[PDB]
Design a protein around this nucleic acid. Structure first.
Ligand SMILES: [Mg+2]
Ligand SMILES: [Mg+2]
Ligand SMILES: [Mg+2]
Ligand SMILES: [Mg+2]
Ligand SMILES: [Mg+2]
Ligand SMILES: [Mg+2]
Ligand SMILES: [Mg+2]
Ligand SMILES: [Mg+2]
Ligand SMILES: [Mg+2]
Ligand SMILES: [Mg+2]
Ligand SMILES: [Mg+2]
Ligand SMILES: [Mg+2]
Ligand SMILES: [Mg+2]
Ligand SMILES: [Zn+2]
Lengths: 206, 60
RNA sequence: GCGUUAAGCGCGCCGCCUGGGGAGUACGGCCGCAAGGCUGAAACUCAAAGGAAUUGACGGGGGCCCGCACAAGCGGUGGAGCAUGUGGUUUAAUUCGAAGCAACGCGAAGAACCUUACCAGGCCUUGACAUGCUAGGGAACCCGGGUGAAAGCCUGGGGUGCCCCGCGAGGGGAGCCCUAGCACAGGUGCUGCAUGGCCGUCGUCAGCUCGUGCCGUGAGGUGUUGGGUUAAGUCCCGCAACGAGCGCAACCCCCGCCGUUAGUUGCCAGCGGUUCGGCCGGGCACUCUAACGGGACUGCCCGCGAAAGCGGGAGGAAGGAGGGGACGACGUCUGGUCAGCAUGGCCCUUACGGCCUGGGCGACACACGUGCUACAAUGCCCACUACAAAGCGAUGCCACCCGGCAACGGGGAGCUAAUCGCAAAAAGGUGGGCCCAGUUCGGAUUGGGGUCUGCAACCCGACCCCAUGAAGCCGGAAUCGCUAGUAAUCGCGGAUCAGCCAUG
């Protein structure tokens, strides 16, 4: 057990807060809680799309919600009827009355959370783990970026023994509180147990 | 965190002195913080994922 | 490894081998004075016995080298009273986990009920919770009564609108309630040697590797070794290697000097008024406030060195990483946790599900761990009086008055808070008392009264007051922390939290 979360270790600099807004004292908790709820819905729904991150800004009964996807068309929908149900379904949950934006992902092949879920899926589809991995890695590696690295839990293949798979190219400096490394964790339910998927992606500098 | 034991949200306590915090994610009612309402675990995590505004990693 | 002292190239001749163990044993024969010797099997049995070399680990092997690791030194623990954890004892239960360092005030930043998962007793079963099905009555929901510790069981009356069709009675039908059957909830019920997740730990140790090339049949080695230097695989020079990655460093935070910005903090510092409490006028200078930014780089001089780097000096707030954080490599241990959460398999589903009251998690004659308070005059008591930082506060912090010895009650102002309150900081300083004695040291235990919180404080609360005033006169073997603003010592704050066993 080691290696702090590269994100939170960088929250001060090269990386920000998924929920930026103020309050406190007697609202925070209630308000904060409110966030887990949305993120709750957006995640169980906009999956097949590529939920990458969920920014949530606030200014008193006026939330933001800016879902990050790779295939925004799925979030949107036919002509945009589904961004009507979600946007509306979100209210039946929070009467705060908020909007909902959707920013496409510039080559999801560079979004940790995605580079992982990608892998995740493959695993659940019973795909050689060692490959999906080496595969994903090269992808990132091959789509710009100066460094990538994917890690997969144990039971790789339903092995009776809890193993670990590696693979990783370029530079990936988790200690350099400046590097600006994207992180992401994909869980992998499976007939033989649960497998965790970690993906780091290193982009430029500042 | 037996779902049943998660009945703190059952206002009706018969005697307020019977109410108790409970985690709002783990249920882990052991060591919770009022400000956030998070089982000390279900807090260090979110605080890392960055889903806890201004909750910066302390340091001095 | 051998290499014209061949284990090379050849020829002549001789001896000898043909898996290990049984065996150089049994038997036969020859030989010996004898001990024995030479020749020398098999049954049986095992899949090996074995040779050289590679990586690594290990050595009561060696050289080098770090870390309060040892030493030097200061304080302490092991003794006692108590507090807290743990074992053993024990209990109807004293739920469970954690165990050498890397368990033992650890999960539990808060067990009187709750929490609580244990125990007894009473009690409910589609259930305290989620989606959905079939038959039926009535449906939302609100308010009384009986038995009861509570739960719950039994039961009584107000009251249905909503859409469609129908003169209307009335019928159909959606959300819901209830009985019954079902899919199923639920399970802190086993398994962390099925797992994710997160953490501990060797280690903040200085290391672990990769590409290409070169060496080698090969495993692999080389680079990563060597000399020097470094906090460091940090840097220099060397070298069949040349590089590069993860780590080291730097980037980031707080403390050190300084400037810019900003002054409802701050000040007779400069000025006049004063109920001389900076109170008002006023001004942002200083203090502070919080943002940005400058600033040390062995850059500078001397000297040792090939170089790195090292000794010293100077200017400077600061010097050779200025102090401290945050940051913990490839991997180790089948390290911890299925009781935070997640999840594979197994198991329970008139019950390992759930509610309730009471009890238990708090006992002891025992042991240990981690602590507090002492055993005293480099002290202890009383009066007076001085300097701090960092946090906290609306379903809260509470000035101020009166009451009570007091805990505290009753009244009650200000504050959503740099500019009101918690607050007196204590050790300290000033006067004085005690005078070496279990003694104005020590506060345990216990009796009695009393306040508060809380539905309730017997099992189990804190606190105030009187009385009692114990063990204790500095700790056996053994053992711990600390190299500075540290150790030691003195208070103040917070989280959880009604209160509180925080001496953590
Ligand atoms: Mg659960
Ligand atoms: Mg012989
Ligand atoms: Mg014979
Ligand atoms: Mg031999
Ligand atoms: Mg050998
Ligand atoms: Mg030291
Ligand atoms: Mg010593
Ligand atoms: Mg003792
Ligand atoms: Mg140095
Ligand atoms: Mg170091
Ligand atoms: Mg570092
Ligand atoms: Mg084990
Ligand atoms: Mg206990
Ligand atoms: Zn939680």
């Amino acid at each position: 057990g080691n290696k702090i979360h590269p994100i939170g270790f960088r929250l001060g600099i090269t990386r920000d807060w998924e929920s930026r807004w103020y309050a406190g004292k007697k609202q925070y908790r209630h308000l904060l809680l409110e966030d887990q709820r949305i993120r709750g819905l957006l995640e169980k729904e906009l999956y097949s799309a590529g939920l990458a991150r969920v920014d949530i800004e606030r200014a008193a009964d006026n939330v933001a919600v800016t879902v990050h996807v790779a295939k925004p068309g799925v979030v949107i929908g036919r002509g945009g009827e589904r961004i009507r149900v979600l946007r509306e379904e979100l209210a039946k949950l929070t009467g705060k009355n908020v909007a909902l934006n959707v920013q496409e992902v510039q080559n999801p092949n560079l979004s940790a959370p995605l580079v992982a879920q990608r892998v995740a899926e493959q695993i659940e589809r019973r795909f050689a783990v060692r490959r999906a991995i080496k595969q994903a890695v090269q992808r990132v590696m091959e789509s710009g970026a100066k460094g990538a690295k994917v890690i997969v839990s144990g039971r790789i293949g339903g092995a009776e023994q809890a193993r670990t798979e590696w693979a990783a190219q370029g530079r990936v400096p988790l200690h350099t509180l400046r590097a600006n490394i994207d992180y992401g964790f994909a869980l992998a339910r499976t007939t033989y147990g649960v497998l965790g998927v970690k993906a780091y992606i290193f982009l430029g500098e500042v | 965190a037996r779902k049943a034991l998660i009945e703190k949200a059952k206002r009706t306590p018969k005697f307020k002195v019977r109410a108790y915090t409970r985690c709002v994610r783990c249920g882990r009612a052991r060591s919770v913080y009022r400000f956030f309402g998070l089982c000390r675990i279900c807090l260090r995590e979110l605080a890392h994922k960055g889903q806890l505004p201004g909750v910066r990693k302390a340091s001095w």
